[model samples]
Each structure stands twice: as structure tokens, then as C-alpha cells.
Target: THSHGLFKKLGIPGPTPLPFLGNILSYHKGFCMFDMECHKKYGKVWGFYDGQQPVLAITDPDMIKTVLVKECYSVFTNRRPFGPVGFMKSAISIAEDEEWKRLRSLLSPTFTSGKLKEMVPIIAQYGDVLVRNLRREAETGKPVTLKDVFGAYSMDVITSTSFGVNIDSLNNPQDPFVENTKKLLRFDFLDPFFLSITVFPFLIPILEVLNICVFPREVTNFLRKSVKRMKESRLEDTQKHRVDFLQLMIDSQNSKALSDLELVAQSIIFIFAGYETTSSVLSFIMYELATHPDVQQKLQEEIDAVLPNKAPPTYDTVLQMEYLDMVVNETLRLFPIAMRLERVCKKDVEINGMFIPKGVVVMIPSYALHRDPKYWTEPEKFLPERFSKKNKDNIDPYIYTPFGSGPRNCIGMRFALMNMKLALIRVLQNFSFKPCKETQIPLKLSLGGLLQPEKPVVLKVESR
Candidate 1:
């Protein structure tokens, strides 16, 4: 109610909020649905409450450009604060100002094209594991929950690429690395600890003092210990022959650059940030393909022509598959993992006559913008051609940014795309997805923090 009044005072359009809950409960179907509806109900800009925190949602392309690009460094350098989240505080995503700049610059080199090229074979090995698992279902003609399949694949990929540990999640789902990674990202609001922290932000400090964390401390410590062991091992190894992200960071460790604690925090952040989102994209791409067989066939044709007898899709092979690129882009547009991208205003400023105060959290409702009829035709349809070389140029980058736009956009974008494209190419080389009864006619998503399918996506695979 406190922030609700402020929205009215500012003359912004938004849904009426309840006394204490504000619009929290309004996100029942998830942020994607709530955000899209809010975009329709209130025009381009709206104010909604997140507890007592007033969040302004913007769909206006020019306003978004002003916020995400023009003022990215000067006015919106940091994202919304996570308060004291232990070592996660040092993670690049949440670190502020100069710390963020330092971490960003140090980590940026690891994701560059040259470095990721070294990761291609490592990534493709996991893709082989993914397809091998699916091949069983293809042989049996049994319905496979593609989300779970892709989840394991992503787990394996992220662990191997980020930490230099090979985890066969498909074969051993109970591996501590796999189990802890899954638990880390499960943001359950109903959990008493999570709820208490949300209702009383001040409790975070008390919880910290008492060594009580809202996150599973055991899980956090397990991941931390894993990174520490790996770091120690890397420090001991004289060869430095490995090419994982961990090795890169460990190699960069000097008293002046990154500390031991910072290195561990970053390695942990990679698993937390990378796993679920990459897997979600994989499943969604397959789901879209299953529902649109014509597009699937076209993509297969491209894959066949490019790879020719599944001749190991290198970074270059996936790059040359233009149709595959179009499909991946189209799918990301429809089902962005992060429903909304947020940045806290560093200083009071106005964009196109819209006055924004310092410390206000501005959200770019990407889901709504991607589906807005103004920017997309047949927005509900799975049309890959919309992203073809010719048509893609007509699309505004701000309106269709699945990985987001500007400096703070997803750093894992290129790595994720290559990981996805390679895995997809490997799958389509031997299998084609067919929708099963469990496949939602229209995908139903549940927030759980990031937008993901409500039910596990079950589909049948045909051995090509």
C-alpha cells in the first residue's frame, strides 16, 4: 500500500494493489503472463509494487533504449541489490560499481569467441550424451520428458565447461554436483525461510548474524567446497593444460586481479546462472519444433545439408546453419527465460518526459515486448522465417532482445547459443521431436523465479 500510493502520485497506470501484498499474488501464472497483461492494461509504462519497493515496468522501445543503453553505465550501472547474500555478493551479476567493472572485465575474456572455440569439442561431447539418452526413447517410441532430458544435458555441459568436471547427469542424476545445482535455483516462495525473508527484509541481517541463510546452506557449502577443491587442484597442477572456465579464472588469479574467494564465487555463479536457463531454451526449442513439423523439417534439411551424415557440428558448422539460427532466435523471442530484465536507477532522470527517481527499479518486460503486435506479426505463431537475414534487419534490437540489450545483457549469450545450437544440431541429425499427450498444447509456464514450463514437456522422438 505504501508504494501503491506512490504509483498513483506519479500518475502511472497499474493494477490496483492489496494492502500488504501489492501485486505479488498477481503473478500467480508467473511474471511472463502478469507482465504481458500489465503491458496491455497499462500502456507503455506502469508502476507496480514488489512489497514496499516500487517497480516501474516499461515496454516503450525508446524508453527501454534510454534505460538499457544510453544510461546503462552512468545511471543504471547496478542491478537491483540482493542485499547480503554471502559469497554470492561477490558474483559478477550482483556486484556494484567498480567491483562489477573489475569482475566484468576479468570474466569477459573467458567468454570471447576464441576461448569458446576451445570449448566446442567439450560441449559437443555432452551433446553426444544428450542424444544418446534420447536415442533410447526413440528406439522404444516412449514419451520423453524433454525438459528433464535437457536439464541433465545442461547440467553436464555447465559443469564440464565451467568447472572442468564431467557429470553424467543423464546416467547419475543423484550426483552431488547435479543435485546441489538443481536445489540452488529452486526459488520456492512458500518455503517458510524464503517467505520470512521476503516479508521482512531486515531479517536478512539477523539471519546472516545467526548463520541462517534463506538458501540451503548445505547446498551452498557443497558447491563452495567443490570449487575450493578444484581451485586447490588447479593451483597445484603445473601443466595448466585444461580449458574450462575454472582454469581460466585460476590462471588469472594474482594478488592484484582476483582473490581466492572471488574466484570461488564466480565459478559458483556460473552454475547458478547457466544451467537452468540454457536447458529451458533447449526444451522450448524442441517443443516449438514438435508443434510445427514443417519448420522442424526445414531445420532438419538445413542441418543435413550442413553437417552431412552428422559429421560433428563444430562451432563453424552450427554458425553456417542459418535456418537453425532463425529457429533458435524465434523460440527465444517467444519464451525468454528471464521474463523481465531489471536495473536500479543510479540517479534521478527523465526519459522522453517520463520522470524516474533514483533507486527505483526499472523493468523491461521482455516477454510482452517480444509478443507485442506492433513489433511482431502473428506473434503467437512459431515462425522461424521472421528471423531470416532479410526480415531480421527490420526488427529493432531493443524490441526483440532475448538475451537483452546493452552492456549488462547476458554475458553467457554467445556460449549459450553455441551450446544450444550444437546440441540441437546433434539431436536433429538423428532424431525429430513429435508432440505427445503430455506436451502442453500451448506451453504453461510457472515462474519459480525464471520463466519455465509448468509441466515437464513430454514428447516422442523419431530416429531419423
Candidate 2:
């Protein structure tokens, strides 16, 4: 196996490894924290082994631009393997080559600007429910868990938009589907094991024998039932315009569209992707706004002046709130949902005059890159103005990629951003928020799961 020469030339540093557990112990202990430590020691580029295989962690914008845009095909053309959650294979996120191209083309039309405009009303209706629920919780003058509220709000938006299902988890809050989805997002030991198996496919049969499930059975069952029901209902009526995501999927084809398993896989991914990431972002934004009351007041003034009479913020209004956009961008910079983006080298390529052999894993840590001192001034400070038109031009394009970069970047970005803006506007119009006793300062992220506060983010909200 090729050793220290290539990495040394590239200025990569890593912890010493032994035999089979090459950096596995460090990863098993914590994924984000371990990565953070490595970033602290080695400026931007670092090398480590997952078992015996060498994986490079890159946080430099220029290097990442090469991997994501210029050399994308040479880096990640073949599928990179997945766990028992074979759902990744069916979705566009993990699909590769011809399949990825085909699926992406098919899915593109569904998320168009016009289609998203139609989804705004559905998102607004959910936002109303969310505000009402929070107001009810705040009546007793007790602190409300922002994460829980945001989680339900996100799920409701996805269900309404994706499946034509009007599930107000914001009202009930303890719905089984909502509970199951949360459990699915939580990190488990089995996930890393399944991920390892994907990198080395020979272990698939062994993983099967072990009977470990990466995708929860309940999640699969719920999605399958929901998709089947939607299909049957569509067949019963030919002329129906739901405008939600499920209807869009159903309407896209002429009879033979997606299969039951494919629909289930796609739907589960849609719900998980739509809810978990955005809610985490909203939670962090709320935490920051609460801590910085001046920023919060400035934001409130903008919201009030732009969206007078408390009517639901329209598309034009949302776009006009540039500072709000900046705040959301800054929040994402601090607490990126997908902390790292992974791609395997599809062919041998030279980066920075050093060879990166085919089949090696390449990772870009967005969280680390956003906070790199070389890229941003006062990287830790919550400053929205940093993203202003003039200041934003000074920042490297690849350094601030919260959604991602390149053609393969997030297709649902516009939808996700609009959903967040609408939800925040609705909540802010009705109440003002401040950090409560349960709030954890300088939030400690949950180790293995998505970037979420270790403790609940309890915030006191007063009705306006």
C-alpha cells in the first residue's frame, strides 16, 4: 500500500494508527469533535485512515473547488457504497453515472421556481399552525424547546408539500410518524458499521448475516404505505392539482412512473432531508438571535417594516429581507447540517503537485472551512453584515458553501431557504424570543447525529 510520501508532500497530518483500527477508535468516539481537533492541528488538509484505507480531509476552498467542480468526474463517478439504507441508492444523492444523470433530469422539473411558488401557501399554512402551537405553550410562561417546535414545523411542511398530507405535528407533537422520523435522524453505532461495509463491499453479506438495519423498519413501512395510498388516490381522480411534492411526482409520468419501493425510498429521503437539516439551522439561528438581542431587534425592525399588517410574508418580501438572509447564512456557517461532503477519487489525479490515487475517499468539512481564519474575519463572531454584497465578494466562493457547491449541490436549496424564511417570519411576527435557563451557552453539538445542541434549546417567547 502507498504510504507517507504522497500525504507528506500534500502537508497532511494525522494521528498514529495501528493495524485494523486505523483511526476507527477516534471516529467511534465522536465524528465532528475528532474532525475539529484535526483541523486545529493541520491548517486545512489532513490525512487519516479509516481502517487501512487512506482518507483525506480537505477544508481549503481552492482545493475543494477542484474536487467539486473542475475534477468532479475524475473524483466521484462510481457509486461510493451505502449501508442497509439502500434508500441512498434509489435517491439522487448517492446515485452515480448514467443513473444519477437520468434521475436528476427527471427530478429537475419538479423543483422549479414556479412549482416552489405553489408550495409557499402550503408552507405558510403549516407556519400558522406552528405559531399557534408555540403561543399555546408560552401561555404558562414556561420556556419552549425551539428544536421540538421547529422539528414539528419542518415535518408538517414536508408532509403538506411532498404528499398532500395535512399532518400538523405542531398540534399533537407526539405523532408516531414524527417520533419515528426523529429516531431515524439520531446516530447509532450501527450506522458507522454500515458505512464501513459500503466502503468495502465484500462485507455486505456479513452485514446481512448480522441482521443490523441502517434504515429503521418503521420509517420504511410508513413511507411505503403513504406512497401507495397517494398513488391509489390519484388513480381514482384524473384531474387533481395538489401542488405538493407527491402530486408533482405522480403527475410527472404517464402511468408508469416510479415503483412502490422507489417511491418509498424517495419519500423517506425527502422528509428526512427537508425536516432535520432546516430545523437544526432554525434552532441555531434562534440561539444566536437570543444571545445577541441587538441583532434580534434589528431583525425584528426589518421584519416589521417590510411585512407590515402581519400578513404572511410573500416571495418578494422574503427576498427583500437581505439581512435575514445574512443571519441564516451565518447560522449555517457556524452549524452546517452536513458538516462534511465526501467523494471518492474515480481516477488518479494530481492536486497541489501530489498524486491522489483512485478509490481514496476525499472529504470537505464545510463546518471547519467556514470557520477557517484564512477565509473569514472573526470567524466565530455572529456577524450577518459579513455577507453583504461588498463583503461577500471578498470571501472565497467555496469557503461559504452551506448547501454545497457545483452542479451536484443540493437541488432542494431554494425550497429549503424559502421554508426557513417563512417559518421565522411567522414566528417573529407573533412573539419575541430570549434564551432561557435550559439553554446551553456556546452549544455543544450532539456527537454523531446532525448538528444539534446537546441540550434542549429552551427559549422564552413573549407574545406581541
Candidate 3:
């Protein structure tokens, strides 16, 4: 084990840890919110230990500039280790160096503008389905949990757009694909199995030796089966087009690229990367829209100007809605997919006269930084206009990274944004979100590694 802190000598404050258990138990209730709450206690430039892995948690913008952007590949690029095998090995999120570069380069074209254009109709198809469901749900006058609604909606979107299988999960809850996909994203780090391995660290190796898989092996089996079906379907298509993510990979397939394993790996991670995160963001946006009618009105007005007849919106037109863009940006700012982002220190160095040791995972707690009152106005309020060009210019560069930034920035942002914008246009033009008594006010977060609403985001809906 490494000597605890150079951070303490550097005048940084942090949660004092236990002998070997570190601060693992502190996060027993939730991960992201726990960090956010701790940030209130320990300003910025703090230390945290993830089972003896000393993580320097930087919540200051200038320091974060060095950590997230300035530090770059040599010092900070690789994320902390995920796992040794199964879906964890297959995930690009935790891949490092040459492996990260190779996988990213191979998969980068999946979200290119042209490819996203080809995939627009697929996202729109699901958007229309969601609208139909929302309208039907609204007519019933009962409060609807928008997270569950959007969860099922985005599940269909990811599965449909990524794998070319129309899971249509919003309406078809009993669908086998939808049911399995729900179980796939269920992760509770505080759960008994995860807690033992996480705090003890040594228990991980012992668990591995015992052949106890940490990742959901059932989901792995299910995805492998699903991808095998898609591969079988791919074999017969003589004139394939790059319509969905799977097809783009299939069309780009050559002697040197993508095996069946790679296909499933990419497809499965694509679901992981985009599915629940986007759904969670959409839920937050809708919740805000529900509570704040004026913001909703403003957004609806912009939607009207661009897409007046409530007809199908084009990809180019979706990009042109500036206010809608601001709202999306603000939603991400408040409720990011990952409450905190991680990048490991590759080698030892000093930044801004602060001496640091090598190989520490720098936890950019942007959840704290993004809401730090100094950089923001009315930090806790839902104000989308703060993202406008003038206000945005006034904000610090390193303060707001909903999907992270720099060399290893989010790889699938374009597709994620496209799905969101098109779907918002589809729904907002026709329906308006109003809060029901069932809706949880102000919202509390649940843990899934990332932060999300603890209770259901139930809302009352009405037609325009």
C-alpha cells in the first residue's frame, strides 16, 4: 500500500479514511450524491481513497483545467480499472492507451454527421412511438413516471438504433429484449456483492478465483445471444446500408476489422454508453419543463418557429434551435450522466506548484465545480438562459463538462444529441409537461455509479 497523502502536506482537505477500508463505507448509501455532499464539506483539491487507491478529487476549475484538459494523455487519460473480463473488458470506457485509441478510431465513424443523418429516421421512429404513448398516458389524467417512460423509450431507441432490433419497449413491457435490457443496466455499487469486493480489494481476486463474476453475467449471456442473432441476420444481406449503428459496423467490416466478438462488444457498450444516461437526462429535462412552465413555453415557442406544423423535423433544423440547445445543455449541466468523471495520472508531476505523486486517479468532481456558487448564478436553480452565448462566455472553460472533455471526450455525443433534439421536437410541439401531486419536488438522487433521481419522476401531461 502507498503512503496516504502528499495532498495533506499540500494543504488540501479530504475525508479522513480508515486503515485499509478507506472511505468505501462513506459511499455505502450512494456514489455521486455522496461525493457531492462531501464536496460541500471538503471544498476542492481533496483526497479520496477507493479501497487504498488514492484518488485526488479536484473540484477547482483551474486545477481541473490541468487535470482534465491540460494534463492530457501522459498524465491523465486512462480511467481507473473496470474488470479483467466479460463486458468490462469489452467496454471502451475503461480501455487505456493503444487499446483506447484503436477502439475509438474504429468506432468513431459510428457517430459521424453522415452516419447520424442516416440514423435520424430510426431515432424519429422511436420518438413518434414515445409521443403516442405519452399522449395516451396523458389522456388517462393519471400521473406518469417520466423516467420509467423515457427508460423504456430510450431502450427501444438504443436497441433499435444500435442493434437494429425494434424492442419498442415503452408499450411492450413484456418484450423479452426489453426485459433483459432492463436487468442489464441494474448496478448497485452499495449492494452486498459489490460492497465486499470494493472495500476489501483483496476480496476481488478471491472472488475471481472462486469464479464469482462481478458484472452481470446474465446480461452478458443475453447480449451475446442477441448479437448472434444480428450477426446471423447480417450474413444474408447482400446490399446492406449504414442505417443503424450495427449496420454501419457491418458495412465497414473488412478482412482486418471487427470480429463477432468485437461487434457484440461495441454493440453492448453502445447500449451502456447511451441507453440509460440519455434516458435519465431526458427525464430531468421533462421534470424541469413540468415545474417551470415559462421555460417550457419558451422552448415550445422555439420549437414552433422551427417546426411549425408539428410535422417531422429535419436534422439540420434540429441543430438550428438555439434555445432548445441551451435547455439541453443546462439539463446536462444540472443532471449529468456521470456526476463525477475519472482520469488516472500516468506519471508523477507538479501542476501550479502543487506536488503530486504518480498513478493517482484524478476524480474531477464536476458535480461540485459545475454548481460552485462562484462560477454560477443561482447555482441550484433551473435556468437554461445561463447557457446562452454571453453568459457562457462569462463562465469558466473547465467548469461544465456534462460528457467530459479533451482527448478522451465522450465518443457518442452526436448520436445522443440527435436522439434527444429530434425527440424533444416531436413531443414538445404536441404535448406539455405539468407536475402532478405524485411528482417529487426538487428531486433526490439514486446511485448507479452515476447520479439519477431516487424517486420516480411522475408528471402530469397535457396536449397543446
Model 2, range 236-335, lDDT digits (tens) per residue? 8867576877776666654425555665666677876777777878988899999998988888888999988887888878889988988888888888
Per-model lDDT: 0.82, 0.76, 0.77
| TM-score: the better of candidates 2 and 3 | 3
Clashing pairs in 3: none
Writing each residue's lDDT as its tens digit, candidate 1 over 206-252 gives: 76787766456788788878887876786777585768888888777
Assess candidate 2 and give its TM-score to the true structure. Answer: 0.91
Q: Alpha-carbon error at 89 in model 3, in Å? A: 0.4
**How many Å off is the CA of 17 in candidate 3?**
1.9
Answer with 1 or 2, whichever has the higher lDDT: 1
Return the TM-score for each candidate structure.
0.94, 0.91, 0.92
Candidate 1, residue 362: lDDT: 94
Please give the distance, in angstroms, between residue 76's alpha carbon in candidate 2 and its true position after superposition.
2.3
Q: What is the lDDT of residue 31 in candidate 3?
A: 68
Model 2 alpha-carbon drift over 4 Å, by segment: 1-12, 173-182, 186-202, 209-212, 255-260
